[PDB]
Design a protein around this ligand. Structure first.
Ligand SMILES: *[C@@H]1O[C@H](CO)[C@@H](O[C@@H]2O[C@H](CO)[C@@H](O[C@H]3O[C@H](CO)[C@@H](O)[C@H](O[C@H]4O[C@H](CO)[C@@H](O)[C@H](O)[C@@H]4O[C@H]4O[C@H](CO)[C@@H](O)[C@H](O)[C@@H]4O[C@H]4O[C@H](CO)[C@@H](O)[C@H](O)[C@@H]4O)[C@@H]3O)[C@H](O)[C@H]2NC(C)=O)[C@H](O)[C@H]1NC(C)=O
Ligand SMILES: *[C@@H]1O[C@H](CO)[C@@H](O[C@@H]2O[C@H](CO)[C@@H](O[C@H]3O[C@H](CO)[C@@H](O)[C@H](O[C@H]4O[C@H](CO)[C@@H](O)[C@H](O)[C@@H]4O[C@H]4O[C@H](CO)[C@@H](O)[C@H](O)[C@@H]4O[C@H]4O[C@H](CO)[C@@H](O)[C@H](O)[C@@H]4O)[C@@H]3O)[C@H](O)[C@H]2NC(C)=O)[C@H](O)[C@H]1NC(C)=O
Lengths: 383, 383
């Protein structure tokens, strides 16, 4: 239990064409120390946890089917929030009202125990910077969020439950949102969302999760290494920091004649994948199909500062492969951090059918480094 | 029937939470003469129609569930394109290549018959002006699109299938994009997208779909009455023209101290609604909740040139209500046009729960005028 492997399971992965469909039965519990059930949501009116999908989570028992995996020795927490649920002021209204926080904490304990959860993972995106609009929220969101965490910490300790949070990798947002010393002390781990540094919103190609500074960078804080050191320098316990790894790529459509390099101007997200059906986004296995079957070209950084990207016509997608997933896990071990986090189980090649690298190659690579699981070498996409 | 009521059904309304969820079972076929399934997409590599959501459209048979409604005496067409599929050059590569057009047409007939579709609705936004960027596309997009339409017409007539298109209401785009006489002759109807004349991109408040010239207008072509007469003057058969009506509002966040009037400076789109969850956009039923429950104030034009708008704090949304929907249908009858188009079914108060005016009040009002369906009177939002 020296290093954690925190696995995000997403309930909406069931609503996917059969080859992409991911159910509780697809979880390999040997590959996780902790599983986060993403996502529950905050009721706008009552400001308490509620299921976002009663039909799957409750009627079809997906909550209980995932928490049942604790018989395998994994801890199973409920994730609250996410990007989509963080629109608007409801989380700000919760944390800035003392009586609302108290109602939330009491209800949360009962909700979690009702379904067998070992605790709660907070994924408010973000305190003050609601959906990264920092002018939107009050400055008091930072202190209100810290107070919610402290009060959840005290109530959870009476129950032996775990409390974690997924947090921003943006220096700007971190400065606005987080009392870093208080969060480090009161959380069992801090999952750094060290991805989505770049995407089609930049209007030019960029890597979803740069590891180190690149010479083409315009901001030297948009990389995992800065993010981790910034949290440490802000007062975070290194063992509390869990470094997220994206199991998906950010895709782009490149302006005609702009080339295939980093920073090339773009006009849209990439064409949607068959399984994930979201322009701007491709699962790792959809990227494998493009490289293996559709002839997309893989571009690598000889300096090892960013992971690969793949191209075809004006399409362009950046992503982490086996080698960068391995490096980031080895970075976690070298830096003596708390572990690695996976976003998300269902976007890995969990069936093994797309990449030819065995089942769940990205997650297996992380477990190899952090937990000593014997494993095959990293697979070369291009091969 | 003398007048058509062309209903857009948007499949990814299925993913909306709570009462915003809209399924094929929510379609009332008696309120439509033609149903368009929005949307399929153009495969970038093969340049043929493909499903945009295999899981809903094919695995769960939503295509066939909607085309099965033709037993009610309605025609069901597949819509291709839409705004999001119209970025980049893929439609331009199709229409400017003779062999690609032939492959597309042959495949399209088989694709439509496979799922029981009665025909195809083309929603390329837009020939030449790709996503209204007129510098991007070649002048030859106009002629290529007309040739595609002509060739689809020939093949569809062998099968008794219908062919339609949704087209721009912008004079500039119309001049660049459409061989109006050829389209009028070869299409079973032309759906004028007579909405989105104004929105947050203007950086000031304006009505989503002005009917007539208003004194605050800076451009006297940005209204439905001009668009319709412009298509007629360009050579369109009046019978072929179908006037679109928006079932949603364009929302704005207004500069502090700028007031609530038309043309007031804005700094962002409006806050997203609970169910449609898109900044700058609110469904009619979301607008009803705001007026009925949240105390938003309704502002009307005594001159009848634009529909209402609603305000609360710095929020501002313009929309068509029952009275303007009725007027636009009565305009269709007075002008002896082809009918009205509804964009889209799922944004109406289709459950009847938000406005208290019965199920699908906007669509019922249009059917009342154009098809003589008995109906309740228009509901006054303010009551
Ligand atoms: C992630 O983010 C971090 C925070 O932003 C980055 O942290 C920075 O990392 C560098 C380390 O590379 C560190 O820089 C200094 O570290 C100590 C200061 O305490 C210095 O000794 C270092 O000086 C060495 O390197 C200099 C090169 O710039 C050189 O000028 C200097 O003379 C000395 O050279 C030795 O080391 C080199 C590298 O091994 C050799 O090439 C060179 O020949 C010298 O080697 C000899 O001496 C060594 C002992 O000094 C010995 O080991 C060797 O065998 C041989 O005998 C250096 O300037 C920053 O301070 C640090 N910043 C913070 C805030 O921590 C981090 O880089 C980033 N990671 C990545 C991958 O980007
Ligand atoms: C949608 O977009 C279109 C753009 O193409 C706009 O089209 C324009 O529509 C106007 C009408 O709104 C049309 O105007 C002329 O139509 C004919 C000319 O052929 C005339 O009959 C009209 O003249 C009458 O109105 C004049 C305007 O005030 C007036 O000066 C004139 O003396 C005459 O007045 C009579 O009619 C008025 C309206 O009923 C009365 O107020 C007035 O007292 C007079 O009524 C008497 O006479 C009537 C018989 O003429 C009789 O019925 C009545 O009982 C009484 O005894 C008019 O000028 C434009 O030609 C046309 N433009 C184009 C380019 O096509 C359209 O307006 C727009 N819609 C909206 C809502 O904006």
């Amino acid at each position: 239990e020296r290093f954690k492997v925190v696995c995000y399971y997403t309930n909406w992965a069931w609503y996917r064409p059969d080859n992409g469909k991911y159910t509780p039965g697809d979880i390999n519990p040997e590959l996780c120390t902790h599983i986060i059930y993403a996502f529950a949501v905050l009721d706008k009116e009552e400001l308490v946890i509620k299921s976002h999908d009663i039909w799957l989570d409750v009627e079809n028992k997906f909550y209980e089917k995932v928490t049942a995996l604790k018989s395998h020795g994994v801890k199973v927490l409920l994730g609250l929030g996410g990007w989509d649920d963080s629109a608007g002021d409801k989380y700000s209204r919760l944390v800035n009202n003392v009586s609302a926080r108290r109602k939330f904490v009491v209800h949360a304990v009962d909700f979690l125990e009702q379904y067998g959860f070992d605790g709660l993972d907070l994924d408010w995106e973000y305190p003050k910077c609601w959906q990264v609009e920092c002018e939107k929220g009050p400055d008091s969101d930072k202190q209100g969020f810290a107070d919610l965490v402290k009060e959840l910490r005290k109530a959870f300790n009476r129950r032996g439950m775990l409390l974690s949070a997924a947090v921003s990798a943006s220096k700007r947002v971190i400065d606005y949102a987080y009392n870093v010393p208080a969060l480090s002390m009161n959380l069992d781990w801090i999952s750094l969302m060290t991805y989505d540094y770049h995407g089609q919103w930049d209007k030019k190609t960029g890597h979803v999760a740069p590891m180190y500074v690149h010479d083409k960078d315009t901001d030297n804080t948009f990389n995992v290494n800065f993010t981790v050191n910034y949290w440490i320098n802000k007062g975070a316990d290194r063992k509390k920091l869990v470094v997220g790894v994206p199991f998906y790529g950010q895709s782009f459509s490149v302006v005609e004649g702009a080339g295939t390099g980093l920073g090339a101007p773009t006009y849209a997200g990439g064409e949607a994948g068959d399984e994930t059906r979201a322009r701007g986004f491709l699962s790792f296995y959809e990227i494998c199909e493009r490289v293996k079957v559709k002839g997309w070209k893989v571009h690598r950084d000889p300096g090892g500062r960013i992971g690969p990207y793949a191209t075809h016509d004006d399409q362009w997608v950046s992503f982490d492969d086996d080698f960068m997933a391995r490096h980031k896990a080895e970075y976690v071990r070298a830096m003596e951090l708390g572990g690695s986090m996976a976003w998300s189980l269902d976007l890995d090649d969990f069936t093994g059918k797309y990449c030819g690298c065995g089942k769940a190659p990205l997650l297996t690579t992380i477990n190899h480094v952090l937990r000593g699981k014997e494993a095959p070498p990293p697979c070369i996409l291009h091969e």
